[PDB]
Paper text:
A similar cleavage reaction was observed in vitro with other enzymes from diverse organisms, including a snake venom phosphodiesterase (SVP), mammalian ectonucleotide pyrophosphatase/phosphodiesterase 1 (ENPP1), Escherichia coli RppH (EcRppH), and [name] [name] ([name]). In addition, although [name] was initially characterized as a nucleolar U8 snoRNA decapping enzyme, it is involved in mRNA decapping and expresses across mouse tissues. Given the versatility in the recognition of substrates with diphosphate bonds, we and others have used some of these Nudix enzymes in vitro for processing ADP-ribosylation to a unique mass tag for site identification by tandem mass spectrometry (MS/MS). In this study, we sought to understand how [name] binds and hydrolyzes different forms of ADPr using X-ray crystallography.
Here we report the crystal structures of [name] in complex with ADPr and dimeric ADPr (di-ADPr). A 1″,2′-glycosidic linkage is observed between the first and second ADPr such that the latter subunit protrudes away from the substrate binding pocket. The second molecule (attached through C1) of ADPr does not make significant contacts to the Nudix fold beyond the mouth of [name]. [name]-di-ADPr structure suggests that the 2′-OH terminus of a PAR molecule is bound by the Nudix motif while the 1″-terminus, which is conjugated to proteins, is distal to the active site. Having said that, PARylated proteins would have even easier access to the [name] catalytic center with less steric hindrance than MARylated proteins where the latter would be closer to residues, such as Phe36′ and Phe61, at the mouth. In addition, the orientation of the PAR suggests a potential exonuclease activity from the 2′-OH terminus in concordance with the purported snoRNA decapping activity of HsNudT1660. However, since there is sufficient space to accommodate an additional ADPr linked to the 2′-OH terminus, we cannot exclude the possibility of endonuclease activity.
Author numbering:
A (entry chain A): 3 to 16, 19 to 180
B (entry chain B): 4 to 100, 104 to 181
Amino acid sequence: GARRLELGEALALGWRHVCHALLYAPDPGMLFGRIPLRYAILMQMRFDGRLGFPGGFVDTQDRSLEDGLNRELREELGEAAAAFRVERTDYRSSHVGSGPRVVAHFYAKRLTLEELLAVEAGATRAKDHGLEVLGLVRVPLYTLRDGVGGLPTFLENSFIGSAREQLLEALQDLGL
Amino acid sequence: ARRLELGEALALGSGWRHVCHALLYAPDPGMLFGRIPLRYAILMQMRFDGRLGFPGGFVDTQDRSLEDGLNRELREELGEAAAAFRVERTDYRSSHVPRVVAHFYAKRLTLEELLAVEAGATRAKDHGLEVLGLVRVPLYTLRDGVGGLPTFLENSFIGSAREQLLEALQDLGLL
Ligand SMILES: Nc1ncnc2c1ncn2[C@H]1O[C@H](COP(=O)(O)OP(=O)(O)OC[C@@H]2O[C@@H](O[C@H]3[C@@H](O)[C@@H](COP(=O)(O)OP(=O)(O)O)O[C@@H]3n3cnc4c(N)ncnc43)[C@@H](O)[C@@H]2O)[C@H](O)[C@@H]1O
Ligand SMILES: Nc1ncnc2c1ncn2[C@H]1O[C@H](COP(=O)(O)OP(=O)(O)OC[C@@H]2O[C@@H](O[C@H]3[C@@H](O)[C@@H](COP(=O)(O)OP(=O)(O)O)O[C@@H]3n3cnc4c(N)ncnc43)[C@@H](O)[C@@H]2O)[C@H](O)[C@@H]1O
Ligand SMILES: [Cl-]
Ligand SMILES: [Mg+2]
Ligand SMILES: [Mg+2]
Ligand SMILES: [Mg+2]
Ligand SMILES: [Mg+2]
Ligand code: NA
Ligand code: NA
């Protein structure tokens, strides 16, 4: 897919910069009792008809990449997002997007389960709800019985740009 | 799957199980970007297997009817905002065919009822467990031509929900 860049290497090009973020939180619940949920991971169904992570374009009124990311999260989720900040400490990888001079920045934030729920809960009151944002979904991590149902089936769905691959890496690296 | 009449499908042996699901929808005067008219908000959901489907579940013997069994599953899967209405036999659509025959419904609500339904749908009993969240079908197609609804239909669905969506979009002039 799109070439993997360094931050500064990509930051060098004077271009459209777009940041998205995976909010996760640890999950002691079990499906049916049997199945481990492990973590609760927040994606969203976009206006595209594709699955993906929240956030969006970085503009000229953004003091830093983070400012725009944290801005585009509040737009898409409402004021549950104002309980945290995704801090570049969270920055994971960059990819050259299919748009005219479009780099894509991927973040991953560890929230607590108690913060994460209130995001879902405040999502109908969001500014872009039923507009850019159609609906928040969780990611299934368990994959069982069928040997195909669960996560694998989930990843057969459509994903925006590089979200599938961003999602896979986060599961690998942050050990599963 | 393969179509059948309702009575035909009610005339069946003890080894058969029945399952009910309902397409909820409401008129929407809003527009995407203040330009693309939206039309209706049509709720679908992310299942435990990552297959896109409609609210609903098995009828089972303990519910008095198919409608009851739908409405109960609907309050479990969607939360207590589904108690604001009740999806009757006059909201039934079709019956399709392991040994199961699946019934599909379409219920037209207010915009305010359907919006109130999304807010409470995280407090639902099956949220996190059975259901992993709610979504709206985009009905528009974007100027690129691929985007919008067509790209939403590229997703992997459960049983015949796709057929049932495409059916429900044309059949009451949502297309
Ligand atoms: N992991 C990933 N990996 C990779 N790329 C990823 C990834 N995740 C997401 N992306 C996506 O991230 C980009 C933007 O997506 P978003 O996440 O939604 O960012 P966002 O929330 O800040 O805003 C979205 C934009 O809003 C729209 O704007 C309207 C409107 O303002 C109006 C005015 O447009 P302007 O040209 O004046 O706006 P500017 O773009 O110039 O600022 O027309 C736009 N529009 C409508 N249809 C089209 C079209 N077919 N082609 C181009 N533009 C279109 C679109 O241009 C954009 O999709 C690409 O779509 C790319 O696919
Ligand atoms: N449009 C549609 N058109 C048509 N069919 C449709 C449509 N939409 C949904 N369906 C499906 O609605 C039926 C099930 O009801 P649901 O719609 O999911 O609503 P519901 O809330 O009652 O949930 C049914 C679930 O199924 C039950 O448990 C599972 C699981 O634990 C499992 C436990 O043992 P297994 O080893 O068999 O698990 P699997 O190997 O089967 O995955 O038994 C149930 N189950 C799991 N997978 C399947 C399958 N492919 N076919 C039939 N039953 C299945 C209940 O505990 C759950 O509630 C059929 O699975 C059917 O495929
Ligand atoms: Cl604004
Ligand atoms: Mg946005
Ligand atoms: Mg977006
Ligand atoms: Mg059930
Ligand atoms: Mg259920
Ligand atoms: Na924006
Ligand atoms: Na409209």
